[PDB]
Enzyme design. Structure first.
Site, PDB file in Angstrom:
ATOM      1  N   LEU A  41       0.830  -1.192   0.000  1.00  0.00           N
ATOM      2  CA  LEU A  41       0.000   0.000   0.000  1.00  0.00           C
ATOM      3  C   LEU A  41       0.873   1.252   0.000  1.00  0.00           C
ATOM      4  O   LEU A  41       2.088   1.203   0.208  1.00  0.00           O
ATOM      5  CB  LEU A  41      -0.953   0.009   1.196  1.00  0.00           C
ATOM      6  N   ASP A  42       0.231   2.391  -0.232  1.00  0.00           N
ATOM      7  CA  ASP A  42       0.949   3.621  -0.519  1.00  0.00           C
ATOM      8  C   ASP A  42       1.505   4.252   0.748  1.00  0.00           C
ATOM      9  O   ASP A  42       0.973   4.069   1.845  1.00  0.00           O
ATOM     10  CB  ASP A  42       0.033   4.621  -1.220  1.00  0.00           C
TER      11      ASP A  42
END
Ligand SMILES: CCCCCCCCCCCCCCCCCC(=O)OC[C@H](COP(=O)([O-])OCC[N+](C)(C)C)OC(=O)CCCCCCCCCCCCCCCCC
Ligand SMILES: CCCCCCCCCCCCCCCCCC(=O)OC[C@H](COP(=O)(O)OCCN)OC(=O)CCCCCCCCCCCCCCCCC
Ligand SMILES: CCCCCCCCCCCCCCCCCC(=O)OC[C@H](COP(=O)(O)OCCN)OC(=O)CCCCCCCCCCCCCCCCC
Lengths: 87, 176, 128, 157, 606, 459, 96
Positions: A41-42
């Site tokens: 995920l970011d």
């Protein structure tokens, strides 16, 4: 008026509000599992998670920390640094 | 303005702008539902021209973002009641008596508190015993003549506690 | 979209729109690294001299002593009498003095000539 | 002890050795050291700073003097006593400074102007004066029990 | 009466025992809070009697003894008078502070420096009592500076916290501005009327009432947080909670206008002065009204509200109606004592958030304080017809029925509408919305102390205003004869404010993202006044003390003018005279020129 | 009064022929006994002052100042340990005997018959304080401070002797009684102006006024505690006492030539309150406080109302006690940390809890505590000067605001906000400091009860 | 980014040391401390009343110009207690 915390309960509440979040799974949800390593995920969404932590616990964590949490174990460790509940 | 490095990053500047914009947007927007709406709106606004590989256009539009952000700031932000400038900010500093004290009690009060004082004495012997040779061998041999960082390596090789531990481990609770 | 936020000596300029945090060439990177090395050396020396268990006394900051000795004793040298400094001194010392002296002239002449006329409000004016 | 070379006699000329010794004693980069310059206002050769330093120096750095914003080694500002928090807030304002002062002075002028307009335009109501019975409270105003009784009476309307 | 004087003097003296008791302790007390609570209750049960004897009897008396400095034609003794307002005002303050003793038992329950706290708080009450009883004006000055410095200590209770000592410094500076006004009034009284004694003052009322009235205006704006001298009031709200409740509910906040009440035959004349009174109070009222909108700190909100109520009392002094202003003091005192106590109960029960941001849904979260806060903010502006009806509405009726400014009435109009709308806003943002505060809740207000305190003060907030307003002699002529839209106008303003804030709440429900139209800025950045003044005027004296005083007048220039010229002159004359190289012909030629210059130039034989 | 002079001559060889660890208790005890003995002084009544001999006479201006001097001696004599305990026994005896000789010349100075005797004992007061501050100054410019002190006080106080001999050979003897009866107006010549300027300028220099106060900060930052308290309290209020006595003569020209001293006093009071608002070196703040209060004293002298004189002597006694207390507080801080600065030693609400009570009480007494003697003095001076001019109340109140301001900042800089958590060498609060504070402040509150003593002869 | 493992090692040693310190601060020997060794309201409401009521009669009324009233109010329907005479009341009201 000050109820003291516990290590297991704060780990449970952190994993709880992580499990509330959308783009991860409740299947393999480990405290000892990083973010860029397996979840992918970011970093943007990582600091969104940091903001969720702060909005649960009501204090800022600073920027030089905010690079280097990366996993729920160190999250629980740093909030244990702040509140300092070590029975 | 940071202990370890000297400059943040480009991405770290963008990230601090995102955190402060999210905080100021919290302070702007009540009722939390339209706040979640506008938060997804700002997440999409960063999704607009995120993934470009330019440098000059990236920093130029980041500057224009800073301009339109300093216009779009809320003037009295909801900072938490632990922040500097907030509501507590060492609220309970009245009872944050430092730990170098308490040796200068009369020993009748030491007869009042035997166990804690004996254990503090063995803490003090642990402080003095593991102090000079190994810790100062690290801090006089292991770096370069220029230290060039505010961190310190631990006592990673063999023996005692990681160096310079005392007035960081032995600190008040921040909450009596 | 914005008037660029003019600064003053009172109103500070924030750290976002510097704009000196944009074209950070390797000279300025090197300068920030050197400043980091300065602060690292200072805090390393401090933390060496600070955590000693056998140490009793104070830390004896020479920067604070230097600021105090510069602020108190190291004023009178170095001095040169400039015409601008002298005129500013004679204006900031004698100006208000002769101002309040003129107004005490005024009020005292008015009051003394009024009581020489005898038309004071001395219906009873005991606590002089 | 305390060496004499940790005081500061003499000003900034000449530029190699003075700036060299200033970088020595002040623990600064050479071009970061700046004299004022000397203008007969004393000051020795003390460093010029970016001069705000207190609503700057953001608190999460966690330095050594938390309510002083020092680091135990700094060029302390020459006018530091005015700068500290609890003395002068040198913050970046949310809006401007000139817009602030002009609109505040305009608001004050507007309110005092309408106050003077009120002071020439009073309220009054369809009510006459109070017909006090006995010569407008004579002998209970200023007195004169035998000096001047005056004939004046109201007529019923 | 020996009974009457004895009971008033023991209401004074029973607030002297506990301070010397703990200073004579040399032991470890436990129930010293209980001791202070029961002796304040004892003070109340003593002071309930003389008011009843007063309205039954009259007999408005003065006591005076222990004189010192009978030096010139005056003498000053410890001297105070029990009269109408100065007698019925004591038990209100006693009972309010008894409630604050209860609420401080709850609020500071886990902080073991409570003994020094109650000592400071009791001494503050004693000083406030010595202020409000006195007629000898030096005793007024004693109580005046004493409550100023006890206000300093109570604000700066939490050492540390740069907000606190900053705030306390601001408060004490503005109170010294009150001090210069008060001593100007004192000086004029001494020089023209031989004393500062209101018996002799009100026996001989002069027509020149200009310089002492200006001193009174300056003391009033120094004490009562007025336009230009307000911003130590939210700054003062930065102290602890029952500190702020006592500090700006009844005590320390009405004492400025209390003096103007006290000087009412002196201010029967000089209509220039009453014009300045009402114009100043209207300025305060509308300025803190427009500043009062768009703020999200509840303590600062109630500070702006009580500043507006003080502005209405300044208007009430401007019109010749002092007794309505005193009745407003009493009603306002009970009212916002109960209000501060309620909101502080909420904030301390909910982890010290204190902010309207992240506050919203607390309806049916514990219902007792919600009932308390809605009775409070409904009794604000006087829902007809309650205690807060009587004071505020007789104020506006006498204001509209007078020879007023024709601008101040509009100020009271718009600001009464504004206090209605932030009353609606503070209710809606405090209770009704969605519950926004984090998890791991501490939702409780179970305390016998707190329920009895809130209990007895709302019971007072129901009845005591009517009870006080009934059995007092009307010292004014009541107007009571109003045309259309002159008596209904209070209800008109409050209902239109209710509708206007209702539609504001309807727009608040929506999703629009309105823009800051800079009345937002002028209302939320405090009217720019603390920012502008506290960056201008501290820069002025601290810059002039550097440049002019330190580096330009005293040290370097005075040490050049007196020591340097003399010392360098003597050094140069030494280095010219004694630096003669050791010849012989030079000395005998000096002898020769001495002989010749004695003979032929300046002769000595002739 | 001779029965007050002669036990001080007996108190000097006590110090010599008492042995080791025996000088201290004997000197302290017996000087406290002398404090009782001259607490027995106040017989003064009605029409005249208490007047006994060709040698002696005492006013009720001289009475509280003399009681203050003999009360301030043993307090100081206890106060000046911990910095000469490690010194020699002989040098310690020399120190204590020098203090006793200085007290003796103070009493000689206060009970002078003719003003020649006052001048002799005036510079006799001047001389040993030099020796005290120079032999134990404990900072590198005690040289410069003693040099400035002696040269200013002599060369300002030098034409006073000439003018007194001139008044001797123009109007008979110089006893204050007959000069009270043989005064006559000496009108506006120019020699009258020079003579008035000579006498008033000598005592101006002693106060100091703003024009040449520059010796006074160095003489308090570069002095030990004993010479500092003697210097400030007894010497400056002695200068005020001397101006009070000499101002009885030369009445007709003071309306002509008293204007500019009022001017320099008022504007320098404002500028002094400005300059002490910002400076570091905490010890100096009390010195500039003294300059401000004595500028107020000088305004009170040169306006010539009995209200003004009573307020003047009240402010004299009150600032003497307050400044001596606050000097001893600064000495306690300097014993804790070896700094003398202002921003270094911070915190001290946690540490030393009842020391905070004494700092608070001292800043209250600087702050014009509302029944204190300080407020009485300031208040009556404001009354008399508002009688003298209706516009000078602006400067008085601006002084009041800034006085409250710097007193409060002096408080909260040191004992408010954060302990610096690196000092770690302070000992706990001694019983000596608290004993000295109970010796300072209980008499101040007792005089605050019944202040009919401390008001002057125009009571 | 993230930690360097040196910082992880250092920080885990500080975990162990800080937990041991804060547990050691938690004392319980079953005894932290050890000491080696109607009439109330009656006195506190009667005794100052007695002392002040004794003070307010004798000495302070022998001081002559001491505490004084504002006189009671008499009406045209009243009578004097001590001497004794009524006041002849007011005349006819009518057309009220
Ligand atoms: C400062 C100088 C003070 C000189 C001493 C005071 C004095 O007598 O001054 C007058 C003296 C001289 O004045 P004088 O006293 O010689 O004037 C003559 C006065 N009759 C006629 C009454 C004798 O002034 C100076 O010496 C100025 C220097
Ligand atoms: C007239 C003469 C006035 C003299 C005033 C001298 C003030 C010197 C001391 C300055 C000082 O200590 O300032 C501290 C305080 C800071 O206030 P602020 O910036 O709002 O801080 C909030 C949290 N930091 O700032 C203050 O307390 C500012 C002082 C009060 C405002 C003074 C000017 C308004 C009144 C003028 C007369 C009318
Ligand atoms: C009439 C009223 C007069 C009021 C003022 C009188 C006193 C003036 C100030 C006196 C003190 C001056 C002083 O201390 O100056 C310092 C100077 C010594 O310093 P310096 O020259 O650097 O010597 C190096 C030493 N290692 O010292 C000197 O240079 C001293 C020189 C002699 C000064 C004697 C005092 C003045 C006499 C004036 C005579 C005309």
């Amino acid at each position: 008026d000050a109820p003291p915390l516990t290590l297991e309960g704060i780990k449970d509440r952190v994993l709880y509000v992580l499990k509330l979040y959308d783009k991860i799974d409740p299947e393999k949800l480990s405290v000892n599992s990083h973010f860029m390593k397996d979840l992918g995920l970011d970093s943007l969404d990582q600091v969104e998670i940091i903001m969720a932590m702060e909005d649960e616990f009501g204090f800022e964590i600073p920027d030089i920390d905010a690079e280097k949490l990366m996993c729920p174990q160190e999250i629980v460790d740093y909030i244990a640094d702040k509140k300092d509940v070590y029975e | 303005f940071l202990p370890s490095a000297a400059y943040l990053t480009h991405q770290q500047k963008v990230l601090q702008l995102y955190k402060r914009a999210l905080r100021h947007l919290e302070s702007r927007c009540v009722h939390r539902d339209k706040y979640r709406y506008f938060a997804c709106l700002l997440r999409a606004r960063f999704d607009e021209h995120k993934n470009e590989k330019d440098m000059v256009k990236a920093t130029q539009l980041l500057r224009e973002a800073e301009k339109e952000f300093w216009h779009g700031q809320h003037p009295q932000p909801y900072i938490f009641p632990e922040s500097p400038g907030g509501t507590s900010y060492e609220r309970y500093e009245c009872y944050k008596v430092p730990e170098w004290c308490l040796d200068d009690w009369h020993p009748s009060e030491k007869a009042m508190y035997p166990d804690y004082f004996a254990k503090r004495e063995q803490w003090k012997k642990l402080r003095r015993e593991s102090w000079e040779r190994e810790v100062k061998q690290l801090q006089e041999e292991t770096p370069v003549g220029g230290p060039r960082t505010e961190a310190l390596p631990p006592a990673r090789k063999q023996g005692d506690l990681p160096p310079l531990w005392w007035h960081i481990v032995t600190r008040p609770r921040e909450r009596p | 979209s914005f008037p660029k936020y003019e600064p003053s000596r009172l109103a500070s300029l924030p750290t976002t729109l510097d704009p000196a945090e944009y074209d950070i060439s390797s000279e300025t990177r090197k300068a920030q690294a050197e400043r980091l090395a300065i602060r690292s050396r200072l805090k390393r020396e401090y933390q060496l001299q600070y955590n000693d268990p056998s140490r009793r006394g104070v830390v004896e900051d020479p920067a604070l002593i230097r600021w105090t000795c510069a602020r108190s004793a190291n004023v009178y040298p170095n001095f040169r009498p400039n015409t601008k400094t002298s005129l500013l001194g004679a204006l900031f010392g004698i100006g208000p003095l002769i101002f309040w002296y003129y107004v005490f002239k005024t009020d005292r002449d008015r009051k003394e000539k009024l009581i020489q006329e005898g038309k004071l409000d001395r219906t009873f004016n005991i606590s002089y | 002890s305390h060496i004499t070379k940790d005081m500061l006699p003499g000003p900034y000329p000449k530029t190699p050795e003075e700036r060299a010794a200033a970088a020595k004693k002040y623990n600064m980069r050479v071009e970061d050291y700046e004299p004022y310059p000397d203008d007969g206002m004393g000051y020795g050769d003390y460093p010029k700073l970016p001069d705000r330093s207190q609503q700057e120096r953001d608190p999460w750095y966690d330095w050594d003097h938390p309510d002083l914003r020092l680091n135990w080694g700094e060029p302390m500002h020459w006018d530091l006593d005015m700068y500290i928090r609890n003395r002068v807030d040198t913050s970046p304002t949310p809006v401007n400074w000139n817009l602030m002062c002009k609109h505040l002075f305009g608001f004050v002028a507007f309110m005092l102007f309408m106050f003077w307009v009120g002071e020439t335009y009073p309220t009054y109501q369809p009510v006459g004066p109070k017909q006090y019975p006995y010569n407008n409270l004579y002998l209970e105003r200023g007195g004169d029990p035998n000096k001047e009784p005056e004939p004046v009476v109201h007529y019923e309307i | 009466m020996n009974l009457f004087s004895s009971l008033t003097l023991v209401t004074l003296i029973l607030l002297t025992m506990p301070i010397a008791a703990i200073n004579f302790n040399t032991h470890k007390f436990t129930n010293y809070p209980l001791y202070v609570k029961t002796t304040i209750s004892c003070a109340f049960i003593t002071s309930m009697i003389p008011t009843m004897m007063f309205i039954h009897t009259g007999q408005e008396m003065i006591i005076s003894n222990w004189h010192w400095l009978t030096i010139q034609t005056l003498k000053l003794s410890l001297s105070f008078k029990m009269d109408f307002f100065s007698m019925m005002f004591v038990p209100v303050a006693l009972f309010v502070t008894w409630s604050i003793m209860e609420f401080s038992m709850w609020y500071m329950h886990s902080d073991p420096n409570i003994n020094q706290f109650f000592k400071y708080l009791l001494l503050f009450l004693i000083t406030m009592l010595i202020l409000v009883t006195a007629n000898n004006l030096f005793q007024l000055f004693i109580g005046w500076e004493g409550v100023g410095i006890m206000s300093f200590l109570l604000i700066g209770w939490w050492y540390g916290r740069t907000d606190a000592n900053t705030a306390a410094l601001q408060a004490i500076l503005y109170n010294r501005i009150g001090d210069i006004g008060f001593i100007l009034a004192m000086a004029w009284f001494l020089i023209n009327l031989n004393t500062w004694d209101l018996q002799q003052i009100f026996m001989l009322n002069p027509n020149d009432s200009n310089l002492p009235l200006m001193g009174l205006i300056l003391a009033a704006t120094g004490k009562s947080a007025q336009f230009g001298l307000h911003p130590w009031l939210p700054s003062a709200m930065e102290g602890p909670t029952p500190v702020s409740a006592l500090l700006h509910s009844s005590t320390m906040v009405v004492a400025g206008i209390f003096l103007l009440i006290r000087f009412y035959p002196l201010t029967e004349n000089n209509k220039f002065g009453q014009s300045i009174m009402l114009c100043l109070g209207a300025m305060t009222t509308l300025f803190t009204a427009m500043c009062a909108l768009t703020q999200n700190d509840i303590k600062k909100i109630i500070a702006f509200s009580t500043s507006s109520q003080l502005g209405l009392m300044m208007v009430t002094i401007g019109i010749n109606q002092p007794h309505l202003a005193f009745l407003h003091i009493c009603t306002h005192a009970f009212f916002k004592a109960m209000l501060f106590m309620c909101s502080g109960s909420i904030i301390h029960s909910l982890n010290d958030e204190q902010d309207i941001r992240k506050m919203g849904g607390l309806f049916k979260a514990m219902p007792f304080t919600t009932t308390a806060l809605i009775i409070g903010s409904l009794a604000l502006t006087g829902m007809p017809f309650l205690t807060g009806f009587y004071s505020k509405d007789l104020i506006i009726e006498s204001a509209n029925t007078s020879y007023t400014n024709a601008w101040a009435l509009l100020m009271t109009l718009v600001a009464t509408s504004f206090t209605a709308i932030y009353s609606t806003r503070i209710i809606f943002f405090a209770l009704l919305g969605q519950p926004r505060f984090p998890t791991l809740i501490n939702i409780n207000e179970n305390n016998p102390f707190l329920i009895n305190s809130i209990k007895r003060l709302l019971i007072g907030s129901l009845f005591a205003g009517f009870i006080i307003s009934n059995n007092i002699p009307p010292m004014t002529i009541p107007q009571m004869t109003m045309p259309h839209y002159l008596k209904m106008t209070a209800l008109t303003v409050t209902i239109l404010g209710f509708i206007l804030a209702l539609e504001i709440s309807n727009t608040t429900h929506y999703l629009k993202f309105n823009y800051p139209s800079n009345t937002f800025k002028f209302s939320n950045l405090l009217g720019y006044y603390p920012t502008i003044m506290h960056r201008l005027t501290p820069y002025m004296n601290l810059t002039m003390s550097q440049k002019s005083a330190s580096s330009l007048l005293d040290l370097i220039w005075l040490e050049t003018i007196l020591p340097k010229t003399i010392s360098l002159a003597q050094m140069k004359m030494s280095t010219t005279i004694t630096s003669q190289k050791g010849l012989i012909k030079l000395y005998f030629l000096s002898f020769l020129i001495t002989i010749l210059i004695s003979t032929t130039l300046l002769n000595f034989h002739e | 009064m001779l029965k007050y002079i002669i036990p001080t001559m007996m108190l000097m060889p006590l110090t010599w022929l008492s042995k080791n660890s025996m000088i201290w208790i004997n000197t302290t005890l017996h000087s406290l006994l002398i404090s009782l003995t001259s607490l027995l002084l106040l017989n003064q009544f009605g029409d005249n002052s208490l007047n006994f001999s060709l040698t002696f006479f005492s006013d009720s201006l001289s009475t509280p100042l003399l009681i203050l001097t003999m009360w301030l001696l043993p307090l100081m004599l206890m106060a000046s340990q911990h910095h000469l305990s490690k010194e020699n026994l002989a040098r310690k005896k020399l120190f204590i005997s020098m203090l006793i000789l200085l007290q003796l010349f103070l009493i000689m100075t206060f009970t002078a018959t003719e003003l020649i005797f006052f001048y002799i004992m005036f510079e006799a007061t001047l001389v040993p304080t030099l020796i005290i501050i120079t032999r134990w100054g404990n900072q590198t410019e005690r040289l410069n401070a003693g040099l400035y002190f002696l040269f200013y006080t002599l060369a300002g106080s030098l034409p006073l002797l000439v003018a007194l001999i001139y008044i001797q050979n123009t109007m008979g003897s110089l006893n204050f009684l007959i000069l009270q009866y043989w005064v006559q107006p000496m009108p506006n010549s120019w020699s009258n102006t020079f003579m008035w300027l000579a006498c008033m300028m000598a005592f101006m220099v002693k106060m100091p006024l703003y024009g040449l106060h520059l010796w006074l900060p160095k003489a308090h930052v570069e002095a030990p505690i004993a010479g500092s308290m003697v210097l400030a309290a007894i010497l400056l209020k002695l200068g005020g006492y001397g101006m009070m006595r000499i101002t009885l003569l030369l009445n007709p020209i003071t309306d002509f030539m008293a204007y500019p001293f009022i001017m320099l006093s008022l504007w320098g009071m404002i500028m002094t309150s400005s300059i002490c608002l910002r400076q570091t070196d905490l010890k100096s703040l009390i010195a500039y406080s003294s300059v401000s209060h004595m500028a107020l004293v000088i305004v009170a002298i040169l306006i010539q109302t009995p209200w003004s004189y009573m307020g003047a002597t009240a402010l004299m006694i009150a600032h003497g006690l307050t400044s001596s207390m606050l000097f001893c507080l600064a000495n306690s801080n300097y014993e804790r940390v070896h700094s003398r600065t202002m921003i270094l030693a911070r915190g001290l609400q946690t540490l030393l809890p009842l020391m905070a009570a004494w700092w608070l009480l001292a800043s209250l007494t600087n702050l014009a505590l509302p029944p204190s003697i300080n407020l009485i003095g300031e208040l009556f001076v404001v009354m008399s000067t508002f009688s003298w001019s209706n516009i000078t109340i602006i400067l008085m109140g601006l002084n009041m605001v800034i006085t409250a301001l710097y007193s409060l900042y002096m408080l909260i800089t040191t004992q408010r906000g954060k302990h610096t958590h690196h000092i770690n060498n302070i000992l706990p609060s001694f019983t000596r400091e608290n004993a000295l504070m109970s010796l300072h402040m209980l008499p101040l509150l007792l005089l605050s009860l019944n202040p009919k003593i401390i008001l002057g002869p125009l009571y | 980014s993230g930690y360097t493992p040196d910082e992880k090692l250092r920080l885990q040693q500080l975990r162990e040391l800080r937990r041991r310190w804060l547990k050691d601060q938690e004392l319980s020997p079953r005894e932290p401390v050890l000491p080696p060794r109607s009439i109330f309201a009656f006195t506190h409401v009667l005794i100052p009343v007695w002392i002040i009521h004794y003070y307010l009669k004798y000495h302070v009324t022998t001081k002559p110009y001491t505490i004084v009233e504002k006189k009671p109010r008499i009406f045209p329907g009243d009578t004097i207690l001590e001497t004794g005479e009524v006041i002849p009341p007011m005349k006819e009201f009518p057309d009220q």
